[PDB]
């Protein structure tokens, strides 16, 4: 008794779609919402309740549509019930159709969305229409489907480099940076047209070797800077949390075009950066038509014995305790490398899981594999070896988590020897950028604390006592025990120097308080860390006892693997097996 069904494609906001919803599938909607626009050129096809494309008499055509992909079995049949919308919609003749349930799908690829004023627009495909005929006592039915939810797009990269559509592919390859370098970052987010977000939050956390620079965050929407009342910015040592306020959400929601949100900020590479170990940041976009309590994973180091424990709690959107919703799966990721180490699953009876045999010096993160209707809230790290997640039944889509670029420092190891190839203590050195003129590698004092500075001084004084006492001994009095005393003293000075070295610079004075001095221990060991790859010149400032002061500077090469590669000339430690250091040969006075 429903002779015709007219399908209308609309591009409207949710609110306008809700104005239509309550005002009726049914009768023609007389007055359409204010800004809601009807679109012509939209291809709709009718199917069986079992998704099979149908003829006008209701007879199947051997081709079916996938409920979630809309990809059809084979060729679009010539006899199929397909019609293109007019600014009046697609009026189909349902007269020959039996009383039954039918579905109406949109073939998005076949459609050319043309708006009210003839403009060729771009929109989201419609949610399939499940309708039963006769549509009560309606002779000429009208159906107003809702469109699908377009996914937002993101990317995190270095300033300029970010692209949400086509993010860079070589992100694992870390950029070489020296200690104290400011790393300029970019987060680019594309928010879809006509969005109705209750929450648009960006969350950034980095590894301990990257120090987020507070007050560098600059947010813009379609290259127009945001007012401070559009977003709420929380800033910490490890990163930040930017959450769009109602004012800022107005600038991204119900827009006629795709919105582009740009987030720029920076972080300084520090003393806690490990040589040839990359440092990363980690962004997540927690969007939703519902308030969202989700954020970015927070990295953490395992405990002393190499154990990292995950704790999980579940709450409704209100924050009230609920039983465990599903089997929560997590990825244990090396927060520096980005590679997945292990995979953990919490069964619905357990709310804790522990990982064993992890490097205590590496940062790891548990990245929850999305649960339908639940949002992951990684709580603030309070201790090593322990990670907490609060799971909120926010009923929102999975967050966006782009791939992040990595940064890395290089080093070089050295061993102080004589011509007989015997190991020497107390030789002191400087690093010059050139053999002729050339400044000396120093610490940026402004960046280094008074306490830090002073420990370098006292640990240097303590080391010279250990070196003097060792030179005081005879060749046979210099036992492994007497050697170890110089090593303990040296290891403390080298630890102090690295700690004070949180920014480098080049200075004229080879004996300026801030000049980086390297001292050879009882095994002749001495290293430099936090450098850009390149050519340097090691200069001797104090010779070892009984040897001559060297007249020429030893040239050296800092590479991506100069600290760790074998085939260098001499073993840096004892029984390490790696031939991971360069010889510095001292000659006797004549």
Numbering used by the authors: 33 to 56, 62 to 627
Paper quotes:
In S. pneumoniae the genes required for pilus formation are located in the 12 kb rlrA islet and include three genes encoding proteins with the characteristic LPXTG motif. These correspond to the major pilin RrgB and two ancillary pilin proteins, the tip adhesin RrgA and the cell wall anchor protein RrgC.
Here we present the full-length crystal structure of the pneumococcal major pilin RrgB. RrgB was crystallized in space group P212121 and the structure was then solved at 2.8 Å resolution by molecular replacement, using the D2–D4 fragment as a search model. A notable difference from the other major pilins so far characterized is that in RrgB domains D2 and D3 are packed side-by-side instead of end-on-end. D1 makes few contacts with D2, no contacts with D3, and in the crystal structure is offset from the plane formed from D2-D3-D4. The very small number of contacts between D1 and the rest of the structure suggests that in solution there is likely to be some flexibility in the orientation of D1 relative to D2–D4. We further show that absence of an internal isopeptide bond in the D1 domain arises because the β-strand carrying the Asn residue is displaced away from the position required for bond formation.
